[PDB]
């Protein structure tokens with residue numbers, strides 16, 4: 323089997339992407355944030371505290387003839403950004419882009435934190451990291467990909483995120499028309515449960531490439547590119563007036579600037595992030611200071627190749643016996 327679904331930015335800045343997912347019988351379609359940095363499929367639901375729902379579409383398990391309570395199971399997750407959610411668990415039929423998994427754990431939120439409530443466009447998350455990070459207790463549950471894997475034509479999924487435009491998540495096949503050149507594959511460590519890999523270095527704009535190992539994770543659920551402070555300083559030093567602002571919480575730059583590109587290494591290959599991809603717009607409406615798309619990972623404890631980086635590439639999440647990541651230009 324295979325599946326193919328379009329993913330759409332939630333706003334004009336690509337702050338996140340939503341992908342429609344069919345849950346239950348008859349289908350209830352919710353728009354979920356596909357997150358290769360976490361491993362829970364959770365949804366706003368008929369059980370979510372009413373004051374914490376503001377425009378989201380909810381899953382109602384009582385209206386699904388295939389829903390079954392996973393008796394005794396609960397979940398609770400805290401994300402690196404400080405947001406959180408928790409609740410109980412059903413199993414149900416879940417389809418993405420024509421690919422169907424029966425018996426998928428669907429984690430129904432009883433509580434969500436304020437940032438989830440405030441995002442009326444995101445009805446929940448679909449985790450695509452390794453199932454060892456799944457939070458369901460006392461019986462940990464498998465991700466949608468983990469459950470689908472054996473049925474797929476090939477044990478892979480791909481992320482092809484757009485810049486200020488829709489893109490595609492495919493399951494079970496590589497669309498060789500969606501990229502240029504060849505795919506460079508690189509080793510993955512699953513020891514922390516992430517798609518963790520080592521970039522071979524970077525360049526700023528037209529500058530020379532610096533060969534240096536940068537361990538980090540491929541995370542579709544993180545908006546920005548978080549890298550070591552040395553790398554980030556070298557980038558922003560090429561932008562007149564750019565500075566790290568403690569009040570804003572990161573690097574900002576004049577909205578009048580044209581940003582340089584940023585290149586990262588994948589083995590001997592190179593992925594070029596155009597400068598415009600690094601512009602996240604005014605820090606507050608109408609401000610002449612703009613928010614940078616490359617930020618320091620200092621304090622987070624891991625480097626994160628989030629959407630800013632991934633959207634510059636066609637990215638293969640290879641879930642074969644030995645998992646690997648692939649990157650191609652596009």
Ligand SMILES: N=C(N)N/N=C1\N=C(N)c2ccccc21
Pocket residue numbers: 337338355441444543545
């Ligand atoms: N990851 C999410 N589930 N939602 N992320 C966001 N939601 C926003 N409104 C926003 C603005 C700037 C950066 C990220 C986000």
Ligand SMILES: N=C(N)N/N=C1\N=C(N)c2ccccc21
Pocket residue numbers: 335337545570571602603604605606613
């Ligand atoms: N803290 C602030 N006053 N503004 N923070 C932002 N402003 C943006 N444009 C943006 C995009 C992505 C992530 C954060 C921000």
